A paper describes a structure:
Dodecahedron-base is a small icosahedral virus-like particle composed of 12 copies of the Ad3 pentameric Pb protein and is capable of efficient cell entry. Virus-like particles, called dodecahedron-fiber (DF), are generated during the adenovirus serotype 3 (Ad3) life cycle in infected cells. These symmetrical, dodecahedral particles are composed of 12 copies of the viral penton complex, which comprises the pentameric penton base (Pb) and the attached trimeric fiber, both of which are essential for viral cell entry. Through careful examination of the crystal structure, it was determined that residues 48–61 of Ad3 Pb, the Dd building blocks, interlock within the particle through strand-swapping.
The atomic structure of the Ad3 Dd was first determined using crystals of space group P213 in which there are 20 Pb monomers, i.e. 1/3 of the Dd, in the asymmetric unit. The structure was solved by molecular replacement using a model derived from the Ad2 Dd crystal structure and refined with an Rfree = 0.290 at a resolution of 4.75 Å. Structural differences concern principally the variable loop, which is longer than in Ad2 but relatively well ordered. A second loop region containing the internalization motif RGD (hereafter called the RGD loop) is only partially visible in the Ad3 structure and rather poorly ordered. It is possible that the loop is proteolyzed in the crystal as N-terminal sequencing and mass spectrometry of Dd preparations often indicated the absence of residues 313 to 347 (data not shown). As Ca2+ was present during the crystallization, it is most likely that this density corresponds to a bound calcium ion. However, during refinement of the Ad3 model based on the Ad2 Pb structure it became obvious that there was an interruption of the peptide chain between residues 59 to 62, and Fo-Fc and 2Fo-Fc electron density maps suggested an alternative trace. This trace corresponds to an exchange of the N-terminal residues 48–61 between monomers related by a 2-fold axis of the dodecahedron.
Numbering used by the authors:
A (entry chain A): 307 to 314, 348 to 390
B (entry chain A): 103 to 306
C (entry chain A): 391 to 542
D (entry chain A): 48 to 102
E (entry chain A): 52 to 153
F (entry chain A): 442 to 542
G (entry chain A): 205 to 255
């Protein structure tokens, strides 16, 4: 229903967790889909072609 | 080094010769590097579903069953070296990791994924008479990698080795008619499975 | 059906036990038939053995355990998005897991005829079957003891 | 005791003797590239070794 | 004693290796649509200016006025499934009951 | 290159306590009660056909004095035939001298 | 860190194995199970900025 009061739904979640329970921050960033926490693996394997 | 470079070790003559070359060497190869093509592979999944332009009722169930679309894809993996299976799922993910992106968005149903590597002896739980799998379960047992297909979809390894991992290999290992289509797995269709509960209720 | 079109074999994590050609070459008179050159790829092979990439195996105890965790109803791994469609279920794990692992290899290639003069700087090169540089190559120490034969 | 007339051979005709030609070109393709930004055709230089496995 | 020579090291004597591969790239193509890896064939001439075939003809010429032999070492791998049929880890006979009455 | 490895099946007793807690039947144990017809005990030690690769020296042999650029090799099985579970097989051989005419 | 306003949040250097991103999804452009699915893949080093 927090989802039938806004059509008058499915939005519910775009909210990417911000900080953990103990309230430690996840330094998410803007855009909310990328925490400025970079990791070797990903980059290499997952993202940067040849650069 | 340089200067040295010039100077010469001088093995002599008035009689040539040779040597005994022994040698030590080590390496760190990740079972799934791309360089050894334990990285890529081809196969085609469903990518579209509809019915010619008018949505429902008489064929509301049957309409869904009237237009399918297929396309060939080269999907890859995250280099590393993994457990027998691990590897599998990775593809059996990245295979999905394709669907997701295109299937949802084009009426394709998870139902019709159409390409799922996996080990298991679907048919073991068979029975002659029902001509089905009496325990309502493809009895969850590892037997040896295997690739299950839907219609039209297939899998080509030509450009990869994982094949040799899937312990499945061409019998004339030196050409290329090597791709696997619904069509080839003749007779090897899953049995279907049976309904437990119903069988039970009506047990009296 | 395919029992003919192909064949059932075992699981190779090495997935492709490959060989590799060793070739230092400003030392050995170059075996027969190779032409001399200085095109990294050819390089006259001095000796060859296969990859230090072999496979070990162990017994996955996590055999049944999982049968009792998704049966107790709990979280889903990106691996088992279909905990019910018998078909789409993260395939059973095998009794035996296999692991690509490389060991180091010490090998003797034989004895070879070598030029009678070596430049203080020999260059060595390990070539891969499709004759090229393999960079998963760690450290590779070759040593070789000349010795006599023949006479003029 | 081991003395020899051990002879490993094959095609690749014995680096032969008695006279051969020596081709002295100047517009052979690699030469240009590597040596004659220099100057013209009054002088230049040229590889005489006709093997293509060589700069 | 006219001797035109140069680099291309004297087709040398006294012992060399002989590489006997089977998955060298051209070989496949031209000779092994044939069959598998139990047998196949391979050019031994390692010169790239040759189609296996043509090569085939030419000869490695071990010489004489003294014959000889070689030391053949060898590498080989296989994937045998403990229960293949070819090794008869597949069939077997035995007899069971098949009928009962009075 | 087909040898055997062995390990200790920990799944030793576990099963004694699953069909004793009463649950589903595998096509393997259709007779969870007829002492006789019960999916035989599993052994303490399991064994697994596994092939390794093998590097071997066969000795030294006399060879013709002329080889055709294309030697053909063949691995024969005891009942002398083609074995197709044969993966990759690289043989190399260094001629060497002996005797004299 | 403690003694100078630094937050555990901003540790900034943490070796670790794991395929952060595996639990991804295209659309959310996030990790649907609210968890960097706890799996060992291969050592990896995660960084913050500057560190
Ligand atoms: Ca254990």
């Amino acid at each position: 229903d927090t989802t039938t009061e806004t059509t008058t739904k499915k939005e519910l979640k775009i909210q990417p967790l911000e900080k953990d329970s103990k309230s430690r921050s996840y330094n998410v960033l803007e855009d909310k889909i990328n925490t400025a926490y970079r990791s070797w693996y990903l980059s290499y394997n997952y993202g940067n072609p040849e650069k | 080094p340089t200067e040295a470079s010039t100077q010469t070790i001088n093995f002599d003559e008035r009689s040539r010769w040779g040597g005994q070359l022994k040698t030590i060497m080590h390496t760190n190869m990740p079972n799934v590097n791309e360089y050894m093509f334990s990285n890529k592979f081809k196969a085609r999944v469903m990518v579209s579903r509809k019915a010619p332009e008018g949505v429902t009722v008489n064929d509301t169930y049957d309409h869904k069953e009237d237009i399918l679309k297929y396309e060939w894809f080269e999907f890859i993996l995250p280099e590393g070296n993994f457990s027998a299976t691990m590897t599998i799922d990775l593809m059996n993910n990245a295979i999905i990791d394709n669907y997701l992106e295109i299937g949802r968005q084009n009426g394709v149903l998870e139902s019709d994924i159409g390409v799922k590597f996996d080990t298991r002896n679907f048919r073991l739980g068979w029975d002659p008479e029902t001509k089905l799998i009496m325990p309502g379960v493809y009895t969850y047992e590892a037997f040896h990698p295997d690739i299950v297909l839907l219609p039209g979809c297939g899998v080509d390894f030509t450009e990869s080795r994982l094949s040799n991992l899937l312990g499945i290999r061409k019998r004339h290992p030196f050409q290329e008619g090597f791709k696997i289509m619904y069509e080839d797995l003749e007779g090897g269709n899953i049995p279907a499975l049976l309904d437990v509960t119903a069988y039970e209720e009506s047990k009296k | 059906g395919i029992r003919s079109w192909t064949l059932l074999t075992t699981s190779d994590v090495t997935c492709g036990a490959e060989q590799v050609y060793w070739s230092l070459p400003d030392m050995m008179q170059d075996p027969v038939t190779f032409r001399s050159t200085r095109q990294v790829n050819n390089y006259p092979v001095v000796g060859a053995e296969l990859m230090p990439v072999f496979s070990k195996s162990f017994y996955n105890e996590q055999a049944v355990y999982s049968q009792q965790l998704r049966q107790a109803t709990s979280l889903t791994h990106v691996f088992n998005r279909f905990p019910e469609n018998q078909i789409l279920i993260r395939p059973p794990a095998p009794t035996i897991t296999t692991v690509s692992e490389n060991v180091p290899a010490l090998t003797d290639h034989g004895t070879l005829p070598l030029r009678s003069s070596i430049r203080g700087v020999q260059r060595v090169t390990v070539t891969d079957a499709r004759r090229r540089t393999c960079p998963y190559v760690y450290k590779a120490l070759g040593i070789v003891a000349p010795r006599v034969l023949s006479s003029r | 005791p081991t003395e020899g007339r051990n002879s490993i051979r094959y095609s690749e005709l014995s680096p032969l003797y008695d006279t051969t030609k020596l081709y002295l070109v100047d517009n052979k393709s690699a030469d240009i590239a590597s040596l004659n930004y220099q100057n013209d055709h009054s002088n230049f230089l040229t590889t005489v070794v006709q093997n293509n496995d060589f700069t | 004693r006219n001797s035109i020579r140069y680099s291309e090291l004297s087709p040398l004597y006294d012992t060399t290796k002989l590489y006997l591969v089977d998955n060298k790239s051209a070989d496949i193509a031209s000779l092994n649509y044939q069959n598998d890896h139990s047998n196949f064939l391979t050019t031994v001439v390692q010169n790239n200016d040759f189609t296996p075939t043509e090569a085939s003809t030419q000869t490695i010429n071990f010489d004489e006025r003294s014959r000889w032999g070689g030391q053949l070492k060898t590498i080989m791998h296989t994937n045998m499934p403990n229960v293949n049929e070819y090794m008869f880890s597949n069939k077997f006979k035995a007899r069971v009951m098949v009928s009962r009455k009075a």
